[PDB]
């Protein structure tokens, strides 16, 4: 019934604005602390993407959605499949592309509530420490967005979907590293990198039907214009206060 269509960066998470300096300036924080946290998280994202999610293979052939690849994939078990040795638009090539996304889906489902297990020790400890410094620097931004997401998650006829400008594979790494894996099924994540958000919003409406109420949440003009186009109510997150206000509305079931 209620489909919440979320944006990722500067809506649910603070990341890109740590690298650019704008979070620090807008929230009165130390620029040095901010960029350092951002750089460290950036490294963890690329490291996870490359090491576990085939990002070197998939970088120039990434998808809008994890189920997009059409191939003769027979569903064979890939737990002993040797990706490094398989030589990856023909039939064979598409099947190897499809294999990687199916495997990415398996990994995501296996490790969404065990990211520490996925990246291992000592990365796990560095990650947890970094996540704690992030919360302090951002005055609990992620803590607050998670509360909103989980509140929505707990309600019978509500669903969370994510539309991001980040390419799918690194977006998955971000989602994992920011603890968003348990709130977002991988099938509910869409990358607008090549296609633009409008097109993703249309996929979403096709999927959930013309009876659902779509609520668009984001800081950006692109999701706002997409919302307007399809008469979806829009809740702007222009600053942290807008997120707290969203939490109040959700608690009172105004949304």
């Amino acid at each position: 019934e209620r489909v919440f269509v979320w944006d990722l960066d500067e809506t649910i998470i603070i990341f890109h604005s740590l690298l650019t300096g704008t979070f620090a300036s807008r929230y009165g924080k130390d620029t040095t602390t901010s960029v350092r946290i951002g750089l460290m998280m950036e490294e963890m994202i690329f490291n996870l993407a490359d090491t576990h999610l085939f990002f070197n293979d998939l970088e120039d052939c990434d998808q809008i959605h994890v189920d997009d690849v059409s191939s003769d994939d027979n569903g064979q078990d890939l737990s002993t499949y040797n990706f490094s040795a398989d030589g990856f638009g023909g039939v064979d090539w598409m099947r190897k592309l499809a294999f990687r996304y199916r495997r990415v889906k398996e990994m995501y489902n296996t490790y969404k509530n065990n990211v520490g297990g996925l990246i291992g020790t000592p990365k796990r400890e560095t990650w947890l420490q970094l996540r704690a410094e992030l919360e302090a620097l951002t005055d609990l931004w992620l803590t607050h967005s998670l509360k909103a997401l989980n509140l929505i998650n707990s309600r019978p006829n509500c669903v969370n979907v994510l539309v991001t400008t980040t390419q799918l594979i690194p977006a998955l790494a971000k989602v994992l590293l920011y603890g968003l894996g348990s709130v977002f099924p991988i099938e509910n994540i869409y990358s607008a990198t090549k296609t633009g958000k409008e097109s993703c919003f249309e996929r979403i409406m096709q999927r959930f039907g013309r009876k659902a109420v779509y609520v668009v949440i984001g800081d950006g003009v692109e999701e706002e214009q997409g919302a307007k186009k399809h008469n979806m109510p829009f809740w702007r997150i222009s600053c942290h206060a807008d997120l707290e206000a969203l939490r109040h509305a959700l608690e009172l079931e105004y949304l």
Partner: protein, 539 residues
């Protein structure tokens, strides 16, 4: 802004506003300060809406129960009567307008509902509610009915609901406990059930309102009604041989009306606070001031001791105080608004058959408690608009009504108010909303349907039989869509008009060519479009 050097006064339309204007005239003669009395609709809700902006009346009159909310909103000036003045009014009336130790209004008079009965039809009025079905049977034989009273305002039905144990907020430890609401208990259910059964068994109609009840009693069609002292002067005029007496008992217990004290507050935004005080203390609250208002529409048992000594000799006033003493003085706390909202919904829904008594009251309990506990957090206009659109799209119209109620001190809100008004059958308020603001073209279709459907509902009821195709056609002709919600070749025309609303003769010829229309048609379209845009500016 409120004009300095004038007094504007608001009082309800059922009160003696013409008599009050008489006091105003004497005031103006003495002081040079013109006084204007108004009785706008939904006054109790309009005051906070307009006072908030620093606008509205200098002086506001309503029962005291609304005043805590006003004070908490910062809408009221504290009032400064001296010991000499305070001594002239009964202590229990001052209590009704005391809020956190502060007097926040002047008390005027005590209002309690009584049983009003036709002594010709009914020299011995029923002592009990239980004996009323049997009495109605007996009277229906003679072309009469036993009882009619306003079933639209929960003020009138509360005495019965409260009789066997219903209550608003529990009083304990010197304060009303806003977490202990009593609208859902055994006693409240018994009372509302008895009411609904009266309606089921054809002894009353769920659609009876104030006007219908008044008309029937004053025409001698019904033997009894339930009303306050303000109603008595119309009955005088009707020459009906009426008595005023104690309300019937229910399950051996007195009906317990919620007792109001008509009060006059000073707008905190008023530039005339000292003139307002002089008016209230030295003109209105005197034997001559109150008599003038009372003569228009009776005030009830007035707060002013000197004048009440004379009114108390009246058996109608005696009965008023007896009912008041058996009932309960309303709380003045801010949460009374939530209480009345919730109970209003329940009585209407239960009486109409829409919900069972049990379901209606269960929801009222939950709503009153939840609304009374809402945090003061404010949303931006954009956020309010978003909520309004989501709740509409979700079909959550009851939630939407409560959300609108919560808004403190835009198009989306107005559209929401219209939808809710329609949902409630408040068609007059709906039409007011639809006509008073220009709406965006994309909102027209939905708003048009509300206008049409409501008018069909009203027409079909006046007809007593289903509206057919021709009937609907006639309603449409009689009540056209207001211009506030109503206006391929057009495509070319609209895009052109945005660049230039005044094409030359040659440009008209080119447009006629491009649209397949004649130049006469092009000209007419442009003229019409300019007229309409102008009409829309004026809003």
């Amino acid at each position: 802004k409120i004009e300095e050097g004038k007094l504007v006064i608001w009082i309800n339309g059922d009160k003696g506003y013409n008599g009050l204007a008489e006091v105003g005239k004497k005031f103006e003669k003495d002081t040079g300060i013109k006084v204007t009395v108004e009785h706008p609709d939904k006054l109790e809700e309009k005051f906070p809406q307009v006072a908030a902006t620093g606008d509205g009346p200098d002086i506001i009159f309503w029962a005291h129960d609304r005043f805590g909310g006003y004070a908490q909103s910062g809408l009221l000036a504290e009032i400064t009567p001296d010991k000499a003045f305070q001594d002239k009014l009964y202590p229990f009336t001052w209590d009704a307008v005391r809020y956190n130790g502060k007097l926040i209004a002047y008390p005027i008079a005590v209002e309690a509902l009584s049983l009003i009965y036709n002594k010709d039809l009914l020299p011995n009025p029923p002592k009990t509610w239980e004996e009323i079905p049997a009495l109605d049977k007996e009277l229906k034989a003679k072309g009469k009915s036993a009882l009619m009273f306003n079933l639209q305002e929960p003020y009138f039905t509360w005495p019965l609901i409260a009789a066997d144990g219903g209550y608003a907020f529990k009083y304990a430890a010197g304060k009303y406990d806003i977490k202990d609401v009593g609208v859902d208990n055994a006693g409240a259910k018994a009372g509302l059930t008895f009411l609904v059964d009266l309606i089921k068994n054809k002894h009353m109609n769920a659609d009876t309102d104030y006007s219908i009840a008044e008309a029937a009693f004053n025409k001698g069609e019904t033997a009894m009604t339930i009303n306050g002292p303000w109603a008595w002067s119309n009955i005088d005029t009707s020459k009906v041989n009426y008595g005023v007496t104690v309300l019937p008992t229910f399950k051996g217990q007195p009906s317990k009306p919620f007792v109001g004290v008509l009060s006059a507050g000073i707008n905190a935004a008023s530039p005339n606070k000292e003139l307002a005080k002089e008016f209230l203390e030295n003109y209105l609250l005197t034997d001559e001031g109150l008599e003038a208002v009372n003569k228009d529409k009776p005030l009830g048992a007035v707060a002013l001791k000197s004048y009440e000594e004379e009114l108390a000799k009246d058996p109608r006033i005696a009965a008023t105080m007896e009912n008041a003493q058996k009932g309960e003085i309303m709380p003045n706390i801010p949460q009374m608004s939530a209480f009345w909202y919730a109970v209003r919904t329940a009585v209407i829904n239960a009486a109409s058959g829409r919900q069972t008594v049990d379901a209606a009251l269960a929801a009222a309990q939950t709503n009153a408690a939840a609304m009374s506990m809402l945090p003061s957090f404010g949303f931006t206009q954009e956020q309010v608009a978003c909520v309004c659109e989501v709740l509409q799209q979700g079909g959550n119209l009851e939630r939407l009504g409560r959300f609108l109620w919560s808004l403190p001190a835009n198009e989306s809100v107005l559209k929401a108010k219209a939808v809710v008004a329609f949902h409630r059958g408040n068609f007059r308020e709906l039409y007011k909303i639809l006509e008073s603001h220009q709406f965006s073209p994309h909102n027209h279709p939905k708003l048009q349907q509300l206008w049409l459907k409501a008018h069909y509902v009203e027409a079909e009821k006046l007809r007593g039989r289903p509206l057919g195709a021709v009937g609907k056609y006639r309603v449409r002709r009689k009540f056209p869509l207001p211009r506030t919600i109503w206006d391929k070749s057009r495509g070319v025309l609209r895009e052109w008009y945005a660049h230039n609303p005044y094409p030359s003769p040659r440009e008209k010829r080119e447009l006629a060519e491009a649209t397949g229309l004649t130049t006469t048609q092009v000209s007419n379209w442009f003229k019409n479009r300019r007229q309409r845009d102008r009409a829309a500016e004026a809003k």
